[PDB]
Amino acid sequence: TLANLTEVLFRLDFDPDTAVYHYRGQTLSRLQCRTYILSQASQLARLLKPGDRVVLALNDSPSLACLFLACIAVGAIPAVINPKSREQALADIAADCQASLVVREADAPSLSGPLAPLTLRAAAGRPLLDDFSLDALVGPADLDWSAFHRQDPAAACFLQYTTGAPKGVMHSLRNTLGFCRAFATELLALQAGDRLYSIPKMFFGYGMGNSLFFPWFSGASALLDDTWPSPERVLENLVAFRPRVLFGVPAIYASLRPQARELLSSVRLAFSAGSPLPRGEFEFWAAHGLEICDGIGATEVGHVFLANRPGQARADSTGLPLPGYECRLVDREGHTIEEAGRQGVLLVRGPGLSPGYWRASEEQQARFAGGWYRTGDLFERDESGAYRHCGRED
Template sequence: MTEQLTAVVTGNAATVLDACCERGRGDATAVECGDRTVSFRRLLDQTCAAARGLTGLGLVPGDRVLLALDDGPEFLAAFLGALRAGLIPVAANPGAPVDDHRYLLADSGAAAVVADPGPAAALVGSGVPVVAVGVAEGALRYDDLVSDPAFLAPADVDPDDPGFVLYSSGSTGRPKGVVHRHRDLSVTAATFGARVLEVTGEDRLFCTSKMFHAYGLCNNLIFPLWFGATAVILPGRRDLPRILDAVEAYRPTLVASVPSVYRALLAVPGARERDLSSVRRATSAGEALPAAVFAEWRAAHGWELLDGIGSTELLATFCSNLPGRTRAGTSGVPVPGFRLRLLAEDGTEIDGAGRGALQVSGGTAFSHYWNDPERTRRTVDGPWVSTGDLYSRDEDGFYTFQGRTDDVFKVHGLWVSPVEIEDVLTAHEGVREAAVVGVPDGSGLTRITAYVVPSGDPDGLVAALRAWLPSRLRRHQFPRSIEVVPDLPHTVTGKVQRFRLRERS
């Protein structure tokens, strides 16, 4: 699986840049970020400078460094610099509320912070050094931190040593620190990057998710660096017209996004007339891609969206539709290098077609949850990781998302999958987005509540849906209540936060 990789890394993951330079990619463009371009050799210099600067703050191998940075060369240099120094970068959303940053700082026990001006200013006085990329009163200057780009040998680490921490997206509550090893980066590249995307040094990768999230880290850092390709990074807020403008202007060959963004992009005026012909492969993850969205993109631009599933715990996409082997509405088949199994309610493994709780085994699996051994014990079963997802598998081995295991519920003694109802709701022309939850009524029985975001005029939508749904749903799936709302609560990665809807019901 490594024959396609420009960089084969067996120890400290940050040496990926050394390998790229040694294999003749030093002067090639590693990053395009707005009007800035950075070569692999220049990024190696910046990484060495960041590593030296962080150790100059008194940090020692094993210390955590909180990174609350927007995507850009600074994030790459700080992340890889921390790895190079044997430190453990902890990626955080720079746009999150101040309380979230304080929580992550306390939970991770980070010994230093490198952040954009907003979070940097908020964390000054927290008892650890704070470095600002930009100006923040009381913070150290990033430019001073990285003032010495002389080569710095990487710290000697074992591939199985803790490498970095990502916090889960919080679709089910408080984010959890997920600890990954150095080797997980290389295995991610050698599996999904090599076997599904088939990345080469000629590719240009663009992802709408930020690098503090696993999906963004894979597509904006891991795949470009491990294959000597170019990361096309759009800093700042990625609103829909800017995304379309970026694809037209920067001509990426590989695009990664999430279903909610793919759906919304086609609603932008003129989106179907845009020149997006540079893209040879596009992937979707984060939540199930509706079959209707798959069909619309194929009709509009000829894109065969490769829908799949990954997780913070697995880092990589471990199940995906494959080029030339897609089935709309499914998450595809296991990516080479991963094993999947379904467990029945009694914990026994399901053979052949069936529906059950999904577990995954593969070389990218996390080592543990930070400061949460009990959750680790509940999630890790030997080589298997419980995803918390309920999936069905058909006779051809394709997997279809049925909801989170804690989202499904029983009505009249029959199991209800919110996703099945949501797919029917979003097939109606008047519905742009939908979410379904089960809530107890006054008698303690579970009733179904559907929240719908209208695609146009909401007048009469509820009545239209009540007339339209009975022929498309089983009786026990029919929503007792349908509420029209202007939007749904999402995580920063686009997943619907059903627990917030349950709180509202």
């Protein structure tokens, strides 16, 4: 059945009066955001035809997340990238996906070059909701817009760009719901009302799931912060927001050690991704009564696909494949490794798997060969089935 991801999220059975995003000491409800998204969608539909690409070079904010979903609502294909990207990096990405539109921070330069996109800027003053000058460009919004562009659930509806010539990972309605269900429901069992805080930003796939999607998907809420996460800023946000679920990385947990007491006041579920969690970090927080759950995700797989399960986490370990995912280890001749304590390259398939790169040579697309994503990570398995990272392929 033809569907639209934003519409599907809006139909999930959660109280429309509960928080969905927090920003600068303010709170926006699901109903407030839906109302704004549809209004903004009414304007974007005047500017973009179905399928047109859009690059958002913005700091984390409710307007970013909503604008992202408004693009999808009208059938556009958005991508969220570092707002402090070098000018050439932003052009290389916008060229790769042939963007029609780029939305940037206030005072940002215009994009140039062959077929350069239209550049619109956010408003100064960091308002809770931003029209990104759409009011002046296409006029005010419709009042009761609902003209969702519905497409095959397997089709691309947004992109994720992770040193080389940039590549765009396609994500579809189907595999996006796939990686949310596996991680937010089956692994973490997030609850309605759960206050989430992801330190990695939404231009990182990890952060896009944590902050953008999971609030809608599970009825939870996420703190959004448009300033860079220094330990000083992270702690103040911890004290003001008191999240129940923290999404961090190993160095973040290392830097939070001198503030263990403040974190323990609210955080009941601590997650780490991006790189291996050292045993030393796992045990320091265990001594303070905090379990840190290490899991691996990759842009090409949507989110975390192999992780320590809450309440059963172990030091120096990446845990188990999430439900629905299958993991395989291959030796240097492409043969599947069955033994434990024998390292090989990790391949994965499952609900979160991307259908491919937006624009790529056949060699690049070969990373998805055979229905598996080749992580390029060396892994070994132990007798319990749990995986441990062993380096990179060569």
